[PDB]
Design a protein around this ligand. Structure first.
Ligand SMILES: Nc1ncnc2c1ncn2[C@@H]1O[C@H](COP(=O)(O)OP(=O)(O)O)[C@@H](O)[C@H]1O
Ligand SMILES: Nc1ncnc2c1ncn2[C@@H]1O[C@H](COP(=O)(O)OP(=O)(O)O)[C@@H](O)[C@H]1O
Ligand SMILES: Nc1ncnc2c1ncn2[C@@H]1O[C@H](COP(=O)(O)OP(=O)(O)O)[C@@H](O)[C@H]1O
Ligand SMILES: Nc1ncnc2c1ncn2[C@@H]1O[C@H](COP(=O)(O)OP(=O)(O)O)[C@@H](O)[C@H]1O
Ligand SMILES: Nc1ncnc2c1ncn2[C@@H]1O[C@H](COP(=O)(O)OP(=O)(O)O)[C@@H](O)[C@H]1O
Ligand SMILES: Nc1ncnc2c1ncn2[C@@H]1O[C@H](COP(=O)(O)OP(=O)(O)O)[C@@H](O)[C@H]1O
Ligand SMILES: [Mn+2]
Ligand SMILES: [Mn+2]
Ligand SMILES: [Mn+2]
Ligand SMILES: [Mn+2]
Ligand SMILES: [Mn+2]
Ligand SMILES: [Mn+2]
Lengths: 288, 288, 288, 288, 288, 288
């Protein structure tokens, strides 16, 4: 919805957004939204995401698809009305994204998802890309484990000529929806086949906001299938714009750079990562 | 509708348009149209805006969507007939934009929306853009607060990978319509995802005229997602053409330039803005 | 329809076309077609123009839209048959343009619309363009007043972010049709948003012939929204091809050049215009 | 249909095609096909041409459109079957082009349409183009009169901002069909708006074959609306390929070059034309 | 269908393919498939080819179109099932190409179609192209006569502005189907208008395989309507890829080069052709 | 589905994937999936692949198409539900790819398909391409025989102007599905006509994952029909991205380079191949 501000309430908003990244306990936002989600009546639509065609499928708090749901509305504070309706397994009325309010008045944040190696990491969409064919897959997995911390991270596999990899976009969105509804740390191996269909376009444009709102982080691998020309600069450009955080390779072996958006209108931070390979290509991110 | 002129009536028109920006009390036009809007019979369609598909949704003076409205016509002075009809929540007959006359014979104006730092600001569409990834978000908010003056400004959030940000174009237009119907100062954070669908195309082409007619100002952030090449010059070009006022960054830190169209065929003014950051990235525009 | 010629009848045609611009009394052709139009039976379709979709709306001699009209045909001299039918406010059968014969055997003319400053001006489409962001709006208005002479000129406003400006293409064509049916001198402020939909494409391709046939002049502003590169040369190119007359800016302040097509296969004339601004940007074209 | 050959019958074919241009009496082929056309049963479809949409309208020997015609077939020598059916004023079954056999075994000819200034001219499509904005209109008319000889030439006007010029593609094809069905020499002023819709595409691809088969000549003006760059070379290229004869301007004032295809696999001739203007831009082609 | 191989059966396949071009009696394969075709039950679909829309028409062994044919299936050795069904003159079920097995286990061949001047020529698609506007038409005809030998060659005419030339793609495919079903040597004058609709695209992709399977040769003229730049190199590139044999012009007058694909994975041969013109442009290919 | 990991389970996954290529007995994975496939209830859908339109056809374990199959669902461990339904020979519900689980928890592998010349080869998609018109066909066949070892390899022929070559995309996918369901080593001669329709696009994006999951290898020929410019670099680029293994030609005659992806995030190996031709172009790959 829309929000109103004057100098005073605006300053409070900024302090709150600043705290959402810098001082809140890492992962607390995710814990909070998990709470909001479980307090939702069973069968109640909570998430809508677009499939390849352009239509959208809807899920309940347990990541189960909703096939039929009689039109229901809700009058928000802003005065705006929200309407959701599912007919034949497709949203008849509604919008894409979260169908229940997880944020409230606190919007424009990059909720800290975790802390590692002396650095806080934001939730939302994290794109790992750069000078093609490098080691993006090992990096997203190391990041997944690291930010997972005490928890296991979820792995969504898509569009690669390797065994067990799903190649159907609709199964893919089904996997992403379930992951964001149930896990704080998510890895997507290859956006390669997403970059274009309407469903695919709806994905780059929604994933980050959905994740940031939930308080979960989605770490996506994106190899510039294109040349190794300066098209990678175009990819890096597009990525920086649709990501909460960007991670790109450097000229130095095993070194990556992390560019983070700490929040709406807030300062963008940058820090470096040093890595090394172990047995069977397991990558380790050096801390202290 | 169409208007006729001879040397004399044309001169009066120009003087009136000139006064609408230079001498009228800042924000008086907005107060006037608020008056015209509240004098409209309840349920009467007053605003039509296009959604993604190309169809248009219609709103009444209270920013509530109209689902069904039996065909009704009106014979204007010009002799032209206006017809509006809403069927199944969509305009069956009518045109996009204001469905009730707010302007009358006084057209081609850039109604002064506010005065700040010794400069008058026009209503309509104000695009803030330039040398990418600068500080456009902090600037649109500082401008919003400044032009809001005694009033709070409204904030429409769209297409950014940050918490609580809507990413559905149809919710976005619903937010814009409500904002223009109820507030004099509006901020839109990111046209990034609007630049293309038919609904999106209808937006760049209508927003400015709708706002200028209402007497409200829409301050939109537009980061050249493109390279940092001279594509930003193309963006600045496109922006200057579809905006009532343009605000672009300079080579000098914190300095922005404001280019204003004071009215139909009238002189275009330019003035500079000096800014500085405070705590939590709150930006302040220096006055005296 | 088609016409046949031999050396003799061809020479008579050329003399007649030559006279239509060089010797006829300025504006006489418009007076003549007004006569043909009012002698048409009420309700009889006289003009068809395309709307955005590609379909066409039809008007009667009083500029009122025709919603339903039972199929009717007419056998021309050429042996060709004309058929018109309107169903549900749209042409079921017919063609775009004038539905009644205004020209007869006298075709290929640029009927003199007016005389001013020692120069005759042709009817049809007049495009004012050139080195972007100059002063095209003040110029089309000064031209409108000047060619209007003793009469008021009509002003069609479209696609600009200023108050009261219509942005719906269908309202726009409705405005153009009414203007050509009722006034000799017409001004269109901004073709900016017309340059593309089928209706818009049908416009550039028809307007000039419709105007020239009626004997009215349509003066359209066209700012090269594009860069200030040599794309303006492309715009000037396209304009010269779809216009009866072209008016472009020069390197000299206030100076414009007028390029006129005096008729089918006839010589193209060129003359210069000197201008200056008065109060409130009212532009004056210097005569003697 | 298809034809079979061996060295002997092939040689006879070539001699016959050679004679069709070099030795037959100018215009005899047209006289012959007029004979075949009038011997056709009334109401019988003889010509199908595509309209803008892609569908095709059908005409009888008197150039009257056929609205309904019950399916009828014909078994050709080749063993191939021809079927024609018109439903609701549109070809339900059939192909574009002549629906009755005008050529027979004699195909691949460029039937001499006329003789003038010591040169024979071929029937079919003649495109007049070259270094833009020159004097193409005066030239097509002079050519029309000259090749018309004792007869009047027909003039089809289309897509120009001059009085009485039709701008509807469907009226245009109706004009072309009637012209080819009733006249040996045809002039089309401006293919400008044809170069693209399916109907328009069907036109460039059919006109020449239709004309050549009838034995009539279609002289079409084509100004390279494009720049004056070497895009005119592209236009000249495209034109040479879809024309039976090409006429282009030279660096010498009033001088044009005529490139003629004398027939299938036959030698292509070239000759020059000298011209001068008289009163009211009437152009004269110098003979002796 | 699919075929299985081990070193031994693969070697036999290659020897057989090698013999199909190098040692079989010229034209024997065509005689063999004629035999397979006439042994087919009357009315049985044998060939499917795509029309402009994308749909396909079906023919029986006598080149007569099939309008209705009740679904029928066949279980192949490979275990794959073949299904054919024609409803309303269009393939309801089936695939494009030959609907009856002409090849069997012997696939990947370029069956020798004829022998001339000390060189064997392959069946399939032969594209004659190169440095535009040369003498491609005379060459395809001389080749047709030469490879026809004791038999007459068939000539399919399409897309040229000459008398009797069909310009409807659907008549064209009807002509090609009939030709391949009844003649060993076929000439297609101009693929010019085929290079794009779905039917046209299906043609370049099928013609060669259809011809090679039948054992007939299709000699197609293809003039690079494009510039005379190095776009002809692009055309020559595309042609070499979709042809069984390529014939291109050289810098030497009357000299052409023949590049032949002798079979799947087999050596590509090249030989030169010397030609000269006789009376009425009849071209002769020099042998001894 | 999605999988969860922590440092420990991730390390086990990598060791398992590493073993799937480096230590498992060559071809064991294929033997295993054959086992899973035959244990499937008859009539049960096991494979879905897209046809040209975009729809998908479904096959049972015996490579027979399924025309009708009543909706049935399955609840996976991940909590995700799988649904399959076939109506009128087309998937009403389901996704493309394997419809039965062949991999389980072991995903991201490049199962060793065979061993030859001292090198292990991965299953999945192997693209053979490079400096056009070289000897790709002989190479894919030699590779097929070599990796087939004791077994025969299957050959799918498509899109070449040679006898018996299918040119219908739907027959092609039918051939690929059958091949992967019944053979460990598959050869596809020419992807030339696949590079674009939706079905074709679904192919490049699925084939590798389908093959890798089955444990079979698909060796596809891909000649850069494009120029011999550096577009082949683009083709090689695209190929490396959608292939499990890439095989490209070098500047050295008969020498090819093999680039293999050994698994998810694992090291990419490279080795060279030396070849020579024997009789009838049978190519031999040199071992010791
Ligand atoms: N205190 C500060 N000092 C300097 N720059 C700042 C400060 N706070 C914020 N910024 C800048 O403001 C911008 C952040 O807002 P954001 O909306 O993401 O940027 P933009 O819209 O201009 O691309 C960044 O470019 C950031 O570097
Ligand atoms: N008094 C004046 N002196 C100089 N220039 C003026 C004056 N008044 C108006 N202008 C110019 O006229 C133009 C304003 O009308 P506008 O329609 O926006 O321009 P345009 O259509 O040419 O892009 C501007 O370019 C402005 O700078
Ligand atoms: N008397 C003349 N002397 C020189 N040029 C002339 C004369 N009369 C006409 N022209 C030329 O003939 C052309 C006018 O016919 P038009 O159809 O508009 O041109 P085109 O079709 O070649 O672009 C113009 O280029 C004009 O300058
Ligand atoms: N007797 C001849 N001497 C030299 N050239 C000839 C002769 N006869 C015909 N030609 C050439 O043959 C070609 C004519 O056939 P055409 O089909 O139009 O050409 P193409 O298909 O190669 O563009 C022309 O290029 C023409 O100049
Ligand atoms: N004995 C041989 N010696 C040298 N080259 C050969 C031999 N046999 C076949 N070739 C080459 O193998 C290729 C033929 O198979 P083809 O499928 O048409 O080629 P490709 O798929 O690589 O374009 C040709 O490039 C041909 O020149
Ligand atoms: N032990 C290792 N040492 C060096 N590089 C390795 C090692 N293990 C894996 N890699 C690199 O990791 C990458 C493999 O994972 P992959 O997903 O295919 O790559 P990417 O996603 O970056 O294109 C390869 O670029 C490979 O060369
Ligand atoms: Mn990867
Ligand atoms: Mn921003
Ligand atoms: Mn203007
Ligand atoms: Mn002209
Ligand atoms: Mn030719
Ligand atoms: Mn090959």
């Amino acid at each position: 919805m829309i929000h109103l501000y004057d100098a005073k309430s605006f300053a409070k908003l900024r302090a709150a957004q600043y705290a959402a990244f810098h001082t809140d306990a890492p992962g607390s936002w995710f814990d909070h939204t998990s709470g909001v989600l479980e307090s939702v009546e069973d069968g109640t639509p909570v998430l809508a995401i677009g499939v390849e065609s352009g239509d959208a499928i809807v899920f309940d708090k347990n990541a189960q698809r909703i096939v039929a749901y009689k039109e229901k509305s809700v009058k928000a504070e802003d005065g705006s009305v929200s309407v959701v309706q599912v007919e034949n397994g497709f949203m008849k009325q509604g919008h894409r994204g979260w169908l229940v309010d997880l944020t409230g008045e606190l919007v424009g944040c990059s909720p800290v998802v975790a802390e590692f190696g002396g650095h806080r990491y934001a939730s939302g969409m994290v794109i790992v890309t750069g000078k093609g064919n490098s080691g993006k897959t090992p990096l997203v997995h190391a990041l997944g484990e690291a930010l997972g911390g005490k928890d296991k991270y979820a792995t969504v596999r898509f569009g690669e000529p390797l065994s067990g990899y799903n190649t159907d976009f609709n199964v893919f969105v089904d996997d992403i929806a379930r992951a964001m509804l149930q896990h704080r740390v998510i890895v997507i191996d290859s956006l390669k086949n997403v970059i274009i269909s309407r469903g695919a376009f709806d994905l780059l444009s929604d994933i980050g906001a959905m994740a940031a709102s939930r308080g979960c982080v989605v770490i996506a691998s994106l190899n510039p299938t294109s040349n190794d020309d300066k098209i990678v600069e175009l990819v890096k450009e597009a990525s920086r714009s649709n990501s909460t955080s960007l991670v790109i390779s450097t000229d130095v072996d095993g070194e990556w750079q992390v560019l983070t958006r700490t929040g709406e209108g807030l300062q963008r931070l940058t820090h470096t990562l040093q890595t090394s390979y172990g047995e069977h290509s397991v990558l380790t991110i050096h801390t202290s």
